[PDB]
Nucleic acid binder design. Sequence first.
DNA 1: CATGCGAGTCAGG
DNA 2: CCTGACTCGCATGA
Length: 580
Amino acid sequence: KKMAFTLADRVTEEMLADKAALVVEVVEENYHDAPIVGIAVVNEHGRFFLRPETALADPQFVAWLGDETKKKSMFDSKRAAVALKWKGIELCGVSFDLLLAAYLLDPAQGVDDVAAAAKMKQYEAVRPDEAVYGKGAKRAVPDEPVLAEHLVRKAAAIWELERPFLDELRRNEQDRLLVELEQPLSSILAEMEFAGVKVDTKRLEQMGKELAEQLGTVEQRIYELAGQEFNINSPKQLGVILFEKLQLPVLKKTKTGYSTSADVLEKLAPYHEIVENILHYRQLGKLQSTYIEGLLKVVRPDTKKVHTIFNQALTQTGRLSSTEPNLQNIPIRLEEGRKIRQAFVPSESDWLIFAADYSQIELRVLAHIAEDDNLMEAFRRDLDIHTKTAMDIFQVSEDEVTPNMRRQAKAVNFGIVYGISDYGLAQNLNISRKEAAEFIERYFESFPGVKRYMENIVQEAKQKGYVTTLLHRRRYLPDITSRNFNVRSFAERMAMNTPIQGSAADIIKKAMIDLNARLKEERLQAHLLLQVHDELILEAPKEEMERLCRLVPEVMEQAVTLRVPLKVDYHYGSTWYDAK
DNA sequence: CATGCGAGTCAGG
DNA sequence: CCTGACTCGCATGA
Ligand SMILES: OC[C@@H]1O[C@](CO)(O[C@H]2O[C@H](CO)[C@@H](O)[C@H](O)[C@H]2O)[C@@H](O)[C@@H]1O
Ligand SMILES: OC[C@H]1O[C@@](CO)(O[C@H]2O[C@H](CO)[C@@H](O)[C@H](O)[C@H]2O)[C@H](O)[C@H]1O
Ligand SMILES: [Mg+2]
């Protein structure tokens, strides 16, 4: 049965009630400077559909949109807020976001549209967006009649589902997480995405030029060493050259054939000169295709900025993700790749990039949650945690710790967080299970509180069916009861890791909210540009750097109070590369 | 041919 | 281990 609604030709007062479900539809995946194809409003007076050209030109409607006292319930309000920012219109008063509500209730559900969130509460009187708009090449906005009914049905679903969702969040003790953390954060991410990051395209194009030269040279050397030309970028073709023509040993296989991953190649290097060259080719090729060409493809030519989109409702841990471009994985480990950061510059003359990052926030969080006396004391002394871990597991003094000892202790720490097992650490340390197991055993002997936490959290996940973070985010782990060792083991590692990675995500999100309020109170022009899991990147006038050096670290360090101090390091410079 | 996606790979925290 | 993007190449549609 069709849903009744008014297809309005003009805005009326009853459409501007102080409480309503609102839909501002942006069909394009990337909503930056994208079209708004329709608007739907559902409130106590009825259901309405408005053409965007009409609504967005109406002074009363625009005022209503920007009035914080007029409350709106939506799905993915960031999408609408950003689409509206590009049109110079402010969206305020969003008191409920169904996408974020659904995400907090169960990140694993993968809610990507109103229909999916609605199905969680047995509401199915709304179609999935994909069914209405089609996919990819066939994607298209349907005729007004079909479009209007769909938007009205989505607004109707939001109108009906708000209460049930808030009720469950309340029962889960997640009501404040939604209202005081995720929703306010959504507005901050919208501002960051809209601001964008300026790119020195001339710089990137030059790096690409010289990179192309080097690739050409290495490519030729590889053909020479192989005795023939082939597609180096083809694992299948490369596998034939290495394991058949050159007879290199096969130490690892993939589900489909020979493995040619960097890990395997490093072990084969001593057998043939072609290996080192392939690894070098892989490094430069990655930079060229992904960080030079790929980046240049998404830079807006009129502003020379990239406008990422942060997915706030995707990860099972509470972390954000970044797309088009992904600004959370720009090279930094190797110097050649790190230079790519010289292309990310301040958006204004005489401005600088400021970057602040938490020092070992995940391990500090673990010290707090597990209440491990040894680990807490370590951070209270602000010790080098890897050297300290080495001292304890190997039973040696500080000056007796060798570089390799610290390297292995660091690997244990890198893993301990991710609940890593004997077979997981072994690969990273290129050792055996029995040995790796003894390392973990030694770690627990030194950090008994951590061992107790790992045992207790797994039992809790089994008992409750989920684990939680410091700010009450949750993750259900149904596989925790599986009778399949591998499946159960993974769930166990997730039970151990989620409260750690998840609580660290909670902390930085809270820091972002606190920071934005502080920047406004101080009327600084400085603003957030990016978040990379445990670090915040801002840009500001050079005349604000000294103030930011004291302000940003303090706000980040004071976001939450743990049993151990939080420590933040910071740097600033002319480019993101220099902010080191 | 065009479109699209699983596999393999590798970048970050 | 949490993510996203790029290549290649078998697969399939309009
Ligand atoms: O001593 C703890 C005791 O063992 C428990 C099993 O009986 O088991 C937990 O840990 C093992 C791995 O060590 C997993 O295989 C089980 O699934 C997990 O429940 C627990 O029930 C009890 O407290
Ligand atoms: O939090 C984001 C929210 O949007 C969804 C809707 O399906 O993602 C859409 O937009 C992003 C950014 O452009 C794309 O990467 C996705 O492909 C597109 O579906 C996501 O599922 C939901 O959580
Ligand atoms: Mg750090």
